Amino acid sequence: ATEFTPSVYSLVSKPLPSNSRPSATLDEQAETEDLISQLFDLTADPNALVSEHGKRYSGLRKQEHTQFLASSFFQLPGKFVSLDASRPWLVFWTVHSLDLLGVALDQGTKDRVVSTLLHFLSPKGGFGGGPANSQIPHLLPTYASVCSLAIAGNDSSTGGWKDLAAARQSIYEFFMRCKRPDGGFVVCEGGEVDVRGTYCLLVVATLLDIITPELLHNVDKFVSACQTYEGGFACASFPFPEPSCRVSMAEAHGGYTSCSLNSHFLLTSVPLPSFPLSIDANAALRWTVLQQGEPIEGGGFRGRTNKLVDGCYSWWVGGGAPVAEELVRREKSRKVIPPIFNRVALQEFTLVAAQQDPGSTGGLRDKPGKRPDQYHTCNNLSGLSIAQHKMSHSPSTVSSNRLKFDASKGLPAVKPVAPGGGWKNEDERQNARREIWANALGWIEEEGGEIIVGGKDNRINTTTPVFNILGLRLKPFINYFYCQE
């Protein structure tokens, strides 16, 4: 199981060679290499039986991380005003982390989470970063709020899922107001256009059964043109004057590569003709694996070429690996097994380098020398989950889903903005509903694929690729909106 995933401790740690040309990049790199390698040297090998005397223990300090999240969940100091427009993310980062850590919230606390988020919902459609009387709707808190409601909500009158069902038409209309002709979306009224918006929108549209042909037109082309010569994806593509050509507007980045791969994957389950426009899956896989750092930098992922390793990219880059892998698999099958990244090294980075030093605040972090935060806690843990559990998209599971789908059950179809913007007929809509739902529930935990570095006490729960919520949350949530319970 670990034949092709060598431990950092079993490898030689050497600095990135200078080639006798110093530069600012290398100065930062060497400094970071020093920070990480020195902590690895002070820490006992998580794999060892004789956990050596005097060395720091690398076990996942779940209770410290629980306390970290608890201490900021009910009150934040005045300085956190910098995240006032991101409060649904503070909710999501907390509730998803607790889910991963296996810590349950009581119903009273869950009800507070639901109430808080529902006040962020505008009657015109979508969630904002704060109350509806304070902030306008935005694609990103819409994803964060919807996922948080999947985690903390339920099907009762006070559970919030009822409110989402009623808001389906307005949310759809908000999504359509965000739509640009080239396939891009503004994140909010007068806001920026990038693949974060596309990803957040496609997740929500998939979950709430509000996908139409008019919503998706050119969306595949926008995303596909974000792929750079490096293999990853940039923030956006520019349509040159329907457009003559589309050009990527910046570097391949882990964040935008995650959003792009996930967006593309969601689009593949929508049965529209010659849709979605293909991406280069092999180039995307290559870029992904190349961002895993050397032994000296602890085998964590960096966000872009010649930049620094960072715990949060365990989710953004690591969590894209099973998506890229599946797309590569499909392409080879269209023309006509060892792990694809170092699952062991990534867990070692998380346990050894990304945890706050013991007996302190707890929480997980970017790298040694950086204060832990909610964002890094969530993304380190989400990435750790991907490394611990071999997630695969199973065609046989998708087939079983198709066989049990009940098309006669469902919520009212959304009314399209344009008269011809909907599905051609009910047969085609129901076929689409089936495909979208069946594929959304296609991710499985491979039997015998589990690798828990440092022993079973380090085990966290299995997150779902693409969505980044637990399968146990995803299933009843999507079943509710498709009426498949």
């Binding site: 040309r21 934040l76 006032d84 808080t116 304070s134 750079t228 895993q292 010649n306 170092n342």
Partner: protein, 315 residues
């Protein structure tokens, strides 16, 4: 001491609106007196859709405390257009924001909206500002994406001259001279030399580009940025790997490698990837598999699984 807006005669006609959090909200922020007061009055201003100078002043107060407040930024731009405010003056304020370390997606997008609306006949001074702003922060992602937009948007309007493109390449070359490992600058070179609609891509132009790439490799053999650019370049123009192999072969043990520079341990993992891919080009699948196996077991063990996958793909 702070004077509450309820005590100010300029705001006497305005009834503030409290934040509608609902009962016992999670993740509440203990807002400062100043921020709460400003938001209470913004809520009232925005609800009544007042477009005034006091509303404009208020939005600046809020974004200084929270540069990421997208709602307030949206309202600010509406105010600038409604009041017919000097957008050039607003640009100068945005320059000050960068100096005062106030930054976000929102500030950069606001800048985009301003340049779109101003729509100068020659955007050279804005291009110059952007170059200067990259000095303390040579890899700032937002700045690089904005530069791509600026040149893309204004080129569609026919407003970028050949001289302007020339000086941009000159500037990009200098950035890569200062730091050859700046992947953002490599990405900008790709735009200038390959992807942009007006890029010169004749036979001799591709020859010159190959020379530049290889010389960059020979200068910094372990530079991943340079290797990714080479592989991207050959792939995009469907150019065989074999004829360039003599220039790469020394790193597996047209411009050729230098005695090699000091601190250059061999082999270079991406040179081996090149060698293996060149074998596949020659339909020599067994020789390719042998290189992937060596990468997996000896020369790039972090990616042991990936290189094994590539090895199995040959067999």
């Amino acid at each position: 001491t702070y004077i509450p807006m309820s005590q100010r005669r300029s705001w006497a006609d305005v009834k503030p609106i409290m934040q509608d959090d609902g009962p016992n909200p999670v993740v509440p922020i203990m807002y400062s007196e100043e921020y709460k007061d400003a938001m209470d009055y913004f809520r009232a201003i925005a609800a009544k859709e007042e477009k005034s100078e006091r509303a404009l002043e208020l939005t600046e107060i809020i974004v200084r405390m929270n540069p990421a407040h997208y709602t307030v930024w949206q309202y600010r731009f509406s105010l600038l257009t409604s009041l017919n405010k000097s957008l050039e003056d607003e640009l100068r304020l945005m320059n000050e924001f960068a100096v005062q370390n106030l930054k976000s997606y929102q500030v950069w997008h606001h800048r985009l909206l301003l340049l779109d609306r101003i729509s100068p006949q020659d955007p050279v001074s804005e291009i110059e500002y952007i170059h200067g702003s990259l000095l303390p922060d040579p890899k700032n992602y937002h700045t690089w994406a904005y530069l791509h937009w600026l040149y893309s948007h204004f080129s569609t309007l026919g407003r970028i001259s050949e001289a302007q493109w020339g000086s941009e390449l000159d500037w990009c070359n200098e950035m890569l001279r200062v730091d050859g490992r700046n992947n953002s600058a490599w990405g900008w070179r790709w735009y200038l030399r390959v992807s942009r609609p007006g890029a010169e891509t004749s036979s001799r132009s591709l020859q010159d580009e190959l020379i530049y790439i290889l010389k960059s490799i020979h200068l910094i053999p372990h530079n991943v940025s340079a290797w990714n650019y080479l592989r991207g370049f050959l792939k995009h123009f469907s150019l065989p790997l074999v004829p360039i192999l003599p220039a790469i072969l020394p790193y597996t043990a047209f411009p050729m490698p230098s005695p090699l520079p000091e601190d250059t341990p061999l082999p270079v993992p991406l040179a081996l990837e090149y060698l293996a891919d060149s074998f596949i080009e020659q339909n020599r699948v067994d020789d390719a598999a042998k290189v992937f196996e060596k990468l997996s077991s000896e020369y790039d063990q972090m990616r042991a699984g990936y290189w094994e996958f590539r090895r199995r793909e040959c067999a």
